[PDB]
Motif scaffolding. Structure first.
Motif, mmCIF file in Angstrom:
data_model
loop_
_atom_site.group_PDB
_atom_site.id
_atom_site.type_symbol
_atom_site.label_atom_id
_atom_site.label_comp_id
_atom_site.label_asym_id
_atom_site.label_seq_id
_atom_site.Cartn_x
_atom_site.Cartn_y
_atom_site.Cartn_z
ATOM 1 N N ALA A 128 -9.632 0.366 2.695
ATOM 2 C CA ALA A 128 -10.346 0.381 1.397
ATOM 3 C C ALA A 128 -11.827 0.665 1.646
ATOM 4 O O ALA A 128 -12.431 1.447 0.915
ATOM 5 N N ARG A 188 -16.178 0.814 -7.520
ATOM 6 C CA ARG A 188 -15.905 2.235 -7.662
ATOM 7 C C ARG A 188 -15.645 2.576 -9.123
ATOM 8 O O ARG A 188 -16.196 3.574 -9.610
ATOM 9 N N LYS A 189 -14.869 1.747 -9.826
ATOM 10 C CA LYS A 189 -14.580 1.985 -11.257
ATOM 11 C C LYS A 189 -15.877 1.934 -12.068
ATOM 12 O O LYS A 189 -16.118 2.784 -12.940
ATOM 13 N N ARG A 200 -12.236 4.368 2.481
ATOM 14 C CA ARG A 200 -12.094 5.226 1.306
ATOM 15 C C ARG A 200 -13.380 5.171 0.472
ATOM 16 O O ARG A 200 -13.847 6.219 -0.013
ATOM 17 N N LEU A 201 -13.944 3.973 0.285
ATOM 18 C CA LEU A 201 -15.165 3.842 -0.517
ATOM 19 C C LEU A 201 -16.336 4.543 0.158
ATOM 20 O O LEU A 201 -17.114 5.232 -0.520
ATOM 21 N N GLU A 236 -12.662 -2.090 -5.537
ATOM 22 C CA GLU A 236 -12.116 -1.164 -6.526
ATOM 23 C C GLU A 236 -12.958 -1.279 -7.828
ATOM 24 O O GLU A 236 -13.239 -0.245 -8.465
ATOM 25 N N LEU A 265 -17.884 5.135 -11.583
ATOM 26 C CA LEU A 265 -17.333 6.313 -12.257
ATOM 27 C C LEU A 265 -17.633 6.298 -13.760
ATOM 28 O O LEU A 265 -17.828 7.370 -14.346
ATOM 29 N N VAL A 292 -2.371 -4.081 -9.994
ATOM 30 C CA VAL A 292 -1.998 -2.743 -9.587
ATOM 31 C C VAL A 292 -3.262 -1.961 -9.192
ATOM 32 O O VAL A 292 -4.170 -1.788 -10.007
ATOM 33 N N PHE A 293 -3.327 -1.521 -7.938
ATOM 34 C CA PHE A 293 -4.443 -0.766 -7.359
ATOM 35 C C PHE A 293 -4.414 0.726 -7.623
ATOM 36 O O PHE A 293 -3.399 1.385 -7.421
ATOM 37 N N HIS A 294 -5.597 1.285 -7.884
ATOM 38 C CA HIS A 294 -5.828 2.719 -8.020
ATOM 39 C C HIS A 294 -7.336 2.944 -7.996
ATOM 40 O O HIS A 294 -8.074 2.123 -8.510
ATOM 41 N N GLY A 295 -7.767 4.033 -7.389
ATOM 42 C CA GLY A 295 -9.190 4.342 -7.309
ATOM 43 C C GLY A 295 -9.671 4.443 -5.879
ATOM 44 O O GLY A 295 -10.463 5.332 -5.553
ATOM 45 N N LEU A 296 -9.210 3.530 -5.012
ATOM 46 C CA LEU A 296 -9.538 3.604 -3.593
ATOM 47 C C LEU A 296 -8.183 3.771 -2.892
ATOM 48 O O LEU A 296 -7.930 4.793 -2.247
ATOM 49 N N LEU A 297 -7.321 2.772 -3.029
ATOM 50 C CA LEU A 297 -5.998 2.825 -2.441
ATOM 51 C C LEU A 297 -4.988 2.649 -3.549
ATOM 52 O O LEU A 297 -5.169 1.803 -4.414
ATOM 53 N N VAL A 320 -5.634 -3.025 5.723
ATOM 54 C CA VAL A 320 -5.881 -2.649 4.315
ATOM 55 C C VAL A 320 -7.356 -2.767 3.954
ATOM 56 O O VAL A 320 -7.897 -1.853 3.281
ATOM 57 N N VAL A 369 0.835 -1.194 0.000
ATOM 58 C CA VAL A 369 0.000 0.000 0.000
ATOM 59 C C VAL A 369 0.865 1.237 0.000
ATOM 60 O O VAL A 369 1.708 1.418 0.879
#
Lengths: 92, 277
Positions: B131, B103-104, B134-135, B100, B107, A54-59, B127, A21
């Motif tokens: 997450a 969320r994608k 964040r959501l 994730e 959007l 690979v993470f992106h969008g939240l973390l 973690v 992270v």
């Protein structure tokens, strides 16, 4: 500064897969470059690694299949916030 | 006659403005109870094992939320993600990838309020909690099972995440559910309780089959349905306002606190969820 975390319920741990992270606001381009940097440093030490996601969008960060021997090295990568060993979840 | 749990939360095919995402096992989306109400996404991230049995858990919960005959929010639409294998086991990483994906998807094609149902638990995960936080801060409502370990929900995730609505299970006597030698979790990380014993719902054994199931997953599915009804009636509600509505409309002080360990009695909310009138 980065810390390592693993499940306290030892039978639920999944060693060998880690969630790296990165710090808040790290961009996807930086996460992908950090993942490549870990792969290159690990290969120099004779270890095979695999970037599963690979993470992106939240973390920001990435999922890596690698030996836990590489954790001290991975915690020194730029932008790392913390690393967590994968663990199980169950239907309730 | 009506299933006890639907009577318990009743003080119209509501919840039509909300989409409920379900992260669970595979689902028999052609079951007459949920056909046309559950959209199966292409998402799948499950660990290797150690079709009727594979889809048991998720099919039943989809029925609890939106089912034609026995659902809470019969007008709500659902989207399913497969994060639990045939034995009901998943990973924290798979669940992160699924959150994730939600969320994608939002959007790319925004719709109305979203409710995400997480009928699963593992050990406390920094973690997974991050997450979820964040959501929720992005405006998505998350509802999770408190856990079936007869223990403090703060030791499990996503139950321990404060931004998620964490739901314990009560039975027809409004008492905490026992599940073998274990039972519902409790403590300060639980937000409220909801019916979670002998819940009639869709059975994946046949197109029209029904089976009764118990657990904090079923209780959380009731709260996801109640949240879908509340948000469809008042779509501008923030997460804080929705939590205040859930507490306001809950039955208060009906649980016999003696079932919980002594020190957890003051820390556990004495609330059983219910629909507004």
């Amino acid at each position: 500064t980065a810390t390592f975390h693993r499940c306290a319920k030892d039978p639920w741990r999944l060693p060998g897969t880690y969630v790296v992270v990165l710090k808040e606001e790290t961009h996807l381009s930086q996460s992908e470059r950090t993942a490549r940097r870990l792969q290159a440093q690990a290969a120099r030490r004779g270890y095979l690694t695999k970037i599963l996601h690979v993470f992106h969008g939240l973390l920001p960060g990435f999922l890596v299949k690698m030996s836990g021997d590489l954790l001290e090295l991975a915690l020194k990568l730029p932008h790392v916030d913390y690393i967590e060993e994968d663990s199980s979840v169950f239907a309730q | 006659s009506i299933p006890w749990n639907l009577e318990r939360i009743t003080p119209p095919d509501g919840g039509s403005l909300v989409e409920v995402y379900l992260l669970d096992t595979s689902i028999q989306s052609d079951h007459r109870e949920i056909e046309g109400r559950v959209m199966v996404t292409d998402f799948e991230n499950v660990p290797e094992e150690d079709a009727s049995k594979c889809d048991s858990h998720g099919t039943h919960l989809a029925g609890v939320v939106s089912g034609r005959d026995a659902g809470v929010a019969k007008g709500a639409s659902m989207r399913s993600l497969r994060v639990l294998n045939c034995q009901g086991k998943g990973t924290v990483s798979g669940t992160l990838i699924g959150l994730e994906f939600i969320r994608k998807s939002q959007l790319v094609q925004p719709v109305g309020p979203l409710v995400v149902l997480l009928p699963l638990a593992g050990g406390y995960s920094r973690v997974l909690n991050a997450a979820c936080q964040r959501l929720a801060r992005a405006g998505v409502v998350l509802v999770t099972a408190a856990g079936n370990f007869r223990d403090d929900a703060c030791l499990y995730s996503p139950a321990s995440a404060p931004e998620v609505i964490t739901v314990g299970a009560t039975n027809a006597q409004d008492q905490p559910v026992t599940l073998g030698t274990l039972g519902t979790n409790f403590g300060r990380c639980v937000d409220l309780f909801a019916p979670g014993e002998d819940i009639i719902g869709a059975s994946s054994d046949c197109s029209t089959c029904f089976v009764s199931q118990s657990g904090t997953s079923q209780a959380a599915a009731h709260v996801a349905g109640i949240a879908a009804m509340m948000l469809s009636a008042e779509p501008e509600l923030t997460l804080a306002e929705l939590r205040q509505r859930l507490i306001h409309f809950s039955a208060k002080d009906v649980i016999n606190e003696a079932w919980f360990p002594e020190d957890q009695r003051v820390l556990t909310p004495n609330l059983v969820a219910a629909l507004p009138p």
